[PDB]
Each structure stands twice: as structure tokens, then as C-alpha cells.
């Protein structure tokens, strides 16, 4: 129905056609999480080597 904001140029053109109107974490927090995961991997591996040593 209503065509608005028409802009023409050599590459093309653009406009809006309206039919009806309406009715983060820190660097420290990232490293803390990443090293808590690495420590859990290390704990799991130490337990495996403790087990294999037995």
C-alpha cells in the first residue's frame, strides 16, 4: 500500500512498502571455567595412573 524511503543509485534501488501499521562474561570468568575443566581432566587422569600403578 504505502511506499516509503525510496533510494535510487547506479547499482540498484531500495525502499520499504508498508501494508498496515502496528496495533557478558569477563576474560577471568572464561579462563576460570576453562581451567576448572582442565583440572577435572587432570584429576581423572591422575586417578587412572593411580589405578594402573596398583
Amino acid at each position: 500500500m504505502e511506499v516509503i524511503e525510496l533510494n535510487k543509485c547506479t547499482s540498484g534501488q531500495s525502499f520499504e512498502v508498508i501494508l498496515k501499521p502496528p496495533s557478558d562474561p569477563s576474560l577471568e570468568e572464561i579462563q576460570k571455567k576453562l581451567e576448572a575443566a582442565e583440572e577435572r581432566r587432570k584429576y581423572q587422569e591422575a586417578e587412572l595412573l593411580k589405578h594402573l600403578a596398583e
Binding site: 587422569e45 587412572l48 595412573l49 594402573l52
Partner: protein, 431 residues
């Protein structure tokens, strides 16, 4: 690249290991000297997975040959491809293991294990990025069974972040009359449950029944049984040896196949089944390869898939065929047999197609299934074990080597827990 280190232990391990190298060396156009004489670059694209390069473009298997007896390793040197293996990689003892697991794992094997580990370290050092290890062995004897599982545990101690894959030949009275094999096999399955990532259950019961019933071989030899093993080993390692998308390394295979850590024993399968020396003149159609590979008669583990449920499956088609037709037939199998696939693991069957067929066949398909029906195999070993253990029969052979009854009781309990765990997931439902 991603290098695999292969280890073969005992008579069975070295026999099937030697046939593996003969088969894949032919597929990769490598002659017994270790020279390439092939026609396709796909043969050499991923050659460093199993072979080391050397002076004058020579390819040497990254294989380590182990035995507490010189016998079978003298036969491998005398064999066709024996000349291709690195001589310093032949580690062997003089007194055997006499089909005694305790000898291989605690006394005789304990002496030779450090020499093998030196060869393993040398092969692992020269790896750009080692992915893991693959052992070939049987579980009924003494060296492959006992020493093989000691090696698995000692390797896991030095390389805890690497994948451990095995081709374990499960014993059967149809092939062997050694009375103590159920003890050796139960003791090894206990080790495999805790220390391997992927184990292909190569059952001698299934290989014998395939030879006798299907291939009509009234008197099957070990060569006939091993002809099925080498065909299966070629098929299950195709994804590791050639360029491709699915299960291209041991870790991606484990992540797709193993949903629970202890449930890592696979039912291998192959289509078309072929007799050693027999030529196959009519190629199979894609619907035929598909029906046969999922059929109970084509399984290398003597279990009925219709008696359990598939947790995961990997299908590998080899040869020139319609990629649209394999997709249609794989969906056809899953949709017309949906009861046999766990509903709580969506899209659990993955398919790979490789253009290079194996020697002698224009088209083939290899199946790798993590089915709960594998408990039938462990129940069979467990019944045989309990029949003798119930009366402490033959135990002096093991207690004489320092072992106690409690190890047998614990090995017995751990396998019964493995069976009950496979049953738990068979009976589990999406609600």
C-alpha cells in the same frame, strides 16, 4: 598424518595380523619389498596411517610382532610378505605360554613386555600425530590372551590419551579342544572391558559355522577361518585407510559407536561371503549387499541380532555403485526393522561408500554393529567358565603361577555385570 601402531601377539594374533598386512598391502599397491606399484593416488593419500616411509620411497608397516615362542614368527618371515616387516620389530621369547593366561600376563610375559614397549616407544616417537594402537590376538591361548592384555594396560599407562583398538578372536570348542580356554577368555574380557576403546569380537564359533554351513567346507582349516578374518579386517579399517568423511579415525569411530564406556564390543559382518581361492563371477546388487550384511548368517560373532537391539551401526560399502541406491537400501533396512534399533539414539546407523573394491570382488559391504545381542557370546563363555570354576577344575595351572581364586571370581563377576549391562539397554525405551 594420524598414524596407527599395529601389534600382533601369539599364534592367532600373528597369523591374522600377517593376513591383514598381505591384504591391505595389495589394496595399497605395495609389494613384498615395500615398493609402490599401484595405479591410483587414492592408494597413497593416507598410506602413513599404517606405513612408515623410508629411503627410496619404501613403505614399512608400523607393525610390531610379539610372541613368547619363535615358531609363528619364523613362519611369518618365511611367508610371502615376511620380508616387508622391520626386522628390529620382531620381539620374541623361547619358552611359550602353554595356553596359560597367568604365564602370558604375570610370569613369562612380564619378562618380554619391556622389550616390546621399547619397540612401541620407537614407533610412537616417529609419529607426526599418533592416533592409537590396534592389537590382533586370541583370548583362548596364553600369549595373545595374557600378554596381549598386559601390553594393552602397559601401553595405556604411557599413552593414556590414545585410542586402543583390538581384533580379539573369541574361542569355541568347534575349533579348539583346549579345556582351559574359557578361563583365559574370561580373564582377558575383564581386561578389555576396562582398557580398550573398541574391540571387534571375532568369534571362532561364527567363523567355523560360516565355513561349514554357508561356504560348504566340510573340513575347514585355520586358513579358511582367517580368510573371513582378513576380509573383515580390510572392511572395518577401510575408513581409516582411504579418503572419506565418516569414521576416518579411531576416535571419531569410538565417538559414533560407543555410547557407554564398557559397551565397546562390536559384532563385525561381511557380504558377500567367499571361499578361499573361489572366484565370484556375478557381482552383488546394492539390495543384496544390504540384506546380507545385516543377516545373522553373515556375522563374525555367533549372536542373533534379532535377539537384541542395535545401539549403533556403521556400514561400509566398497566398489562402483549408485550412492542413491545405498542411501535408499540403508533407509529401507532401518525403516522395515525399526524395532531392532534403540529409539533413544536417533540416526544411529552411519554409512560410508569407498570407490576402491577389495581384491577379487567388484562390490562388497562390511558391517560393524554395537548390538546388545553380543551378550549371547559372553553368556556362552560364562557358562563354560562356571562349569569348571564351580569345581575349581584346572586351577592349579594358574595358582601355580602365583594367581589366586579371587581373580577368577572377579573376572567372572565383571563379565556377568557386562551381560546384565547389555540387557539393561536392550530393555530401555524412549519412555
Amino acid at each position: 598424518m594420524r598414524e596407527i601402531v599395529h601389534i600382533q601377539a601369539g599364534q592367532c594374533g600373528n597369523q591374522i595380523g600377517a593376513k591383514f598386512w598381505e591384504v591391505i598391502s595389495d589394496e595399497h599397491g605395495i609389494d613384498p619389498t615395500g615398493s609402490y606399484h599401484g595405479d591410483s593416488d587414492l592408494q597413497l593419500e593416507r598410506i602413513n596411517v599404517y606405513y612408515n616411509e623410508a629411503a627410496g620411497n619404501k613403505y614399512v608397516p608400523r607393525a610390531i610382532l610379539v610372541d613368547l615362542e619363535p615358531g609363528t614368527m619364523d613362519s611369518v618371515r618365511s611367508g610371502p610378505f615376511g620380508q616387508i616387516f622391520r626386522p628390529d620389530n620382531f620381539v620374541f621369547g623361547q619358552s611359550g605360554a602353554g595356553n596359560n593366561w597367568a604365564k602370558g600376563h604375570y610370569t613369562e610375559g612380564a619378562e618380554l613386555v619391556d622389550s616390546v614397549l621399547d619397540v612401541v616407544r620407537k614407533e610412537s616417537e616417529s609419529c607426526d600425530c599418533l592416533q592409537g594402537f590396534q592389537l590382533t590376538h586370541s583370548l583362548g591361548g596364553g600369549t595373545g590372551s595374557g600378554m596381549g592384555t598386559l601390553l594393552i594396560s602397559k601401553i595405556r599407562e604411557e599413552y593414556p590419551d590414545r585410542i586402543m583398538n583390538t581384533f580379539s578372536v573369541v574361542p569355541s570348542p568347534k575349533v579348539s579342544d583346549t579345556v582351559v580356554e574359557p578361563y583365559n577368555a574370561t580373564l582377558s574380557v575383564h581386561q578389555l572391558v576396562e582398557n580398550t576403546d573398541e574391540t571387534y569380537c571375532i568369534d571362532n564359533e561364527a567363523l567355523y559355522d560360516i565355513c561349514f554351513r554357508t561356504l560348504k567346507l566340510t573340513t575347514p582349516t585355520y586358513g579358511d577361518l582367517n580368510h573371513l578374518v582378513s576380509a573383515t579386517m580390510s572392511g572395518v579399517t577401510t575408513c581409516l585407510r582411504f579418503p572419506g568423511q565418516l569414521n576416518a579415525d579411531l576416535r571419531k569411530l569410538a565417538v559414533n559407536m560407543v555410547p557407554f564406556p564398557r559397551l565397546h564390543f562390536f559384532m563385525p559382518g561381511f557380504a558377500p561371503l567367499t571361499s578361499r581361492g573361489s572366484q565370484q563371477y556375478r557381482a552383488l546388487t546394492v539390495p543384496e549387499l544390504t540384506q546380507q550384511m545385516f543377516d545373522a548368517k553373515n556375522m563374525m560373532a555367533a549372536c542373533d541380532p534379532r535377539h537384541g537391539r542395535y545401539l549403533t551401526v556403521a556400514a561400509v560399502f566398497r566398489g562402483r555403485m549408485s550412492m542413491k541406491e545405498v542411501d535408499e537400501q540403508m533407509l529401507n533396512v532401518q525403516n522395515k526393522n525399526s524395532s531392532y534399533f534403540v529409539e533413544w539414539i536417533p540416526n544411529n546407523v552411519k554409512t560410508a561408500v569407498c570407490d576402491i573394491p577389495p581384491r577379487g570382488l567388484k562390490m562388497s559391504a562390511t558391517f560393524i554393529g554395537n548390538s546388545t545381542a553380543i551378550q549371547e557370546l559372553f553368556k556362552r563363555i560364562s557358562e563354560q567358565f562356571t562349569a569348571m570354576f564351580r569345581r575349581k577344575a584346572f586351577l592349579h595351572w594358574y595358582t601355580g603361577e602365583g594367581m589366586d581364586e579371587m581373580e577368577f571370581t572377579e573376572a567372572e563377576s565383571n563379565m556377568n555385570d557386562l551381560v546384565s549391562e547389555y540387557q539393561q539397554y536392550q530393555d530401555a525405551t524412549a519412555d
